[PDB]
Amino acid sequence: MSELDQLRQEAEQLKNQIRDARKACADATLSQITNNIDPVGRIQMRTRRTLRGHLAKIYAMHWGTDSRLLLSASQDGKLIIWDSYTTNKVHAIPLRSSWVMTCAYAPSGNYVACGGLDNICSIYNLKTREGNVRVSRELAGHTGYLSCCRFLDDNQIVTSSGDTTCALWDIETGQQTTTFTGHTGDVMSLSLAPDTRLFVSGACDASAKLWDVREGMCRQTFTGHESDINAICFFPNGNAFATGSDDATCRLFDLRADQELMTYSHDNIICGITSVSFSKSGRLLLAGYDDFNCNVWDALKADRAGVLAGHDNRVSCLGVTDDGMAVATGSWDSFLKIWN
């Protein structure tokens, strides 16, 4: 007869070694060093625009690289490309599933994507104009819902799934070029690095994995949260990233250190974090909680710098522009708002 119990211990002992390698460089926390940096003034953003059109709860959204065109996927099975500046709808795409979990905007503006409980990543060409009937490509493969997707370019797009996997697809052929495996739990979110050679993903196994797109393998595995990581976001300079989990805390992990640099949490905050985004310079970190509230944290001082939307329990999702000019929030009442 065979046995795995031993093989299960080599894994724990190795994990143990890694822990000491990390504890060996954990001399100080970030707050310690920044104990002299001046805290930011109280951040109070105000609504500049209100986008009306969706007939249901907003599930996801994503800004366009021009920091003017944005997308929003709604429980109404509709995909909408807006013009934040005027509040006008440029496109409007009917979906087959009302259960869209994510949607992305290609950095070129030519294509748009989205996927949900349909386990399929659908891509739409905005130039050939498929707003009514056409759907360029339906990326089939995953055996689990599509939690997140982000374009690397016009013919390359990565996806994360509840099937425990991440995949790099070739849009033309529609073939799952690379498969990134390792997580032991459903993959919830992923984030691309600025140079697009690396990307990070968070799963329900409570770990963050750094993958190498070109080489297709896992570089490192981060851990600290004891609950699921629901959201993850790369830092502006690409040497770190943030994560939000069901444990009601945000963690700033640095790639070189291979371990968290700081944690953002408060006793009054008891909800899980499902959304995270950095301001342009990275001084600000926006967190979205499951109670539809949003906190603005000071990346350096680990203290709430403010509240976004004034705790009205109406924020279901959000996103910051490339030019750091504004923040968008989606809601369960079907409206999107822009804030400065």
Amino acid at 29: T
Q: Which is closer to another protein, CB of 65 or CB of 221?
A: 221
Query: What is the Cα–Cα distance from 171 to 151, expressed in whole angstroms?
Result: 10
CB of 241 to Gd ion, least distance (A): 20
Amino acid at 66: D
CA dihedral 157, 162, 164, 170 (to 10 degrees): -20
CB neighbour list of residue 323: distance below 8 Å, 6 or more residues apart = 67, 280
Q: Exactly one of 179, 194, 197, 226 binds another protein (CB under 8 A); which one?
A: 179
Q: Which parts of 204-233 interact with another protein (CB under 8 A)? A: 216-218, 220-221, 227-228, 230-231
Tokens 């939307």, located at residue: 309
Name the segment binding another protein (CB under 8 A); options: 88-96, 125-133, 151-159, 329-337. Answer: 329-337
How many angstroms separate the Cα of 335 from the Cα of each of 101, 140, 264, 328?
A: 17, 31, 29, 10
> What helix, strand, coil percent values describe the chain, rounded to 5?
5, 45, 50
Q: Which is closer to another protein, CB of 125 or CB of 334?
A: 334
Q: Exactly one of 72, 84, 122, 243 binds another protein (CB under 8 A); which one?
A: 84
Binding mask 283-302 for another protein (x = CB under 8 A): xx---x-xxx------xx--
Strand partners, 308: 294
Q: Is 86 in the site for another protein (CB under 8 A)?
A: yes
DSSP class of residue 13 equals H
**Count of chain residues binding another protein (CB under 8 A):** 126
Strand partners, 170: 156, 175
Name the segment binding Gd ion (CB under 5 A); options: 90-98, 134-142, 224-232, 305-313. Answer: 224-232
Q: Which is closer to another protein, CB of 93 or CB of 315?
A: 315
31 closest CA partner among 327, 298, 318:
298
Query: What is the Cα–Cα distance from 317 to 293, expressed in whole angstroms?
Result: 10
Q: Which is closer to Gd ion, CB of 269 or CB of 305?
A: 305
Q: Is 317 in the site for another protein (CB under 8 A)?
A: yes
Q: Which parts of 193-212 interact with Gd ion (CB under 5 A)? A: 204
CB of 153 to another protein, least distance (A): 18
> Residue 207 belongs to what H/E stretch?
strand 207-212
Q: Is 158 in the site for Gd ion (CB under 5 A)?
A: no
Binding mask 28-67 for Gd ion (x = CB under 5 A): ----------------x-----------------------
DSSP class of residue 34 equals T
Binding site for Gd ion (CB under 5 A): 44, 204, 228
